[PDB]
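Long-time lurker, first post.

We've been arguing in lab meeting about whether NP would sit comfortably in this protein at all. Half the group thinks yes, half thinks no, and nobody has a model to point at. So I'm putting the question to the forum: if I give you the sequence and the SMILES, can you give me back a predicted structure of the complex? Inputs are below. Any interpretation is welcome too.
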Amino acid sequence: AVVTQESALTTSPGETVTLTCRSSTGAVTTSNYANWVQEKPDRLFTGLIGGTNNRGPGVPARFSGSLIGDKAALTITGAQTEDEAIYFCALWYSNHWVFGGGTKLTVLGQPKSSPSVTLFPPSSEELETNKATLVCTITDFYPGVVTVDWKVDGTPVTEGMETTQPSKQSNNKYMASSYLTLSARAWERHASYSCQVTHEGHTVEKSLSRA
Amino acid sequence: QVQFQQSGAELVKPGASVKLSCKASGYTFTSYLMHWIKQRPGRGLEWIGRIDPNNVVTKFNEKFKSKATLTVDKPSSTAYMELSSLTSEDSAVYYCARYAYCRPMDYWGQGTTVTVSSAATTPPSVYPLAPGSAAQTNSMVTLGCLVKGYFPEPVTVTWNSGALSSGVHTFPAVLQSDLYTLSSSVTVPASTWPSGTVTCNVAHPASSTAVDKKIVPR
Ligand SMILES: O=C(O)CCCCCNC(=O)Cc1ccc(O)c([N+](=O)[O-])c1
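Top reply:
Settle the argument with this. Predicted structure of the protein with NP, as tokens:
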């Protein structure tokens, strides 16, 4: 079982939106007992639609319980700024539940400007412990859904990339960081280390070097 | 009103089992099913298991049968989860959630985050990061202090000793190998750096450190 939702999306406050939830093993029949549970402002999760269509006690009546055809589907009618959140869909595989990854939602406040990316060096100092550390300073981005791809000389880094999730800064637009961590020889016979960032399917690129 | 008090944060170490509790509050406990759901640090949820407060009975995940004992306390309406001797590989944020017929929920608690670190309270080795990367020297330059290798989580970092708000962004921290790693950034323009000098402050309360490290080109 893969209960597969969407990954991320946007709708402008007022307009309707339909969130879907498809599953690996065929098609969401009522048997599933479909669930929708949302998280918001600092880790509180509120539950939304139970058994494909039943609204939680105080979940406002915009949110719609709708098993659309093959797939289970939540809709948020008249979408509002108080609905910008991550929604989880959950499907009951007979004698146990399985969670989708959620979707993050954006109810389009301040316009969609991009990230001021700036990659960093491993400093002279950690080179004595033989560690050499990489930061990619990815910041000012809206909406909150950017990616991180790293490459060590053409080569896309499969080796140890540690990252952050979109922290909302001061004017309510986001920031992120990506730590690529390596030991000195693993730095040295390598010239261009390349930081790749995408917004809405539109990238940015930064690099360093040695010769 | 109808609340759900889970505890707040926990520090388990590798090979020490944990007993976590969900105190249920303001509803008829036994006649409401309970779930426990793990959120591994920031990507996706996993349902763990299922306690019935009236009869005690549990469905587990395929995934958490060698790990949890879900067990209930009817008089105190508490519903404790126990995780047998654990790996570094399940430091997470754990949530009890109650539910009526078929839901993860209608209510979940706060989410007791039990961070699994065998290493104790230690000082962060902060490094000067220089803007010498791919981009010609134009108008505003972005500088960063990386405060690597600290334990526990609490670092409280001011950049030019206190006075300069206008361009600072500390990052949210990550944890490489049981301890933490974090950087804090800044982007003042050319007619400041190197001239109007830049040096960062590193405050890390528990393991006494108030470190002033200087930034330069290398
Ligand atoms: O008592 C209830 O509220 C409904 C659940 C059925 C009776 C008690 N046994 C349950 O075994 C396990 C159970 C059964 C059905 C179900 O939909 C879920 N679930 O988590 O959603 C769990």
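For your lab meeting: The CA atoms of residues 84 and 105 of chain A lie 5 Å apart. Chain A has two domains: 1-109, 110-209. Whichever side wins, do check it experimentally.
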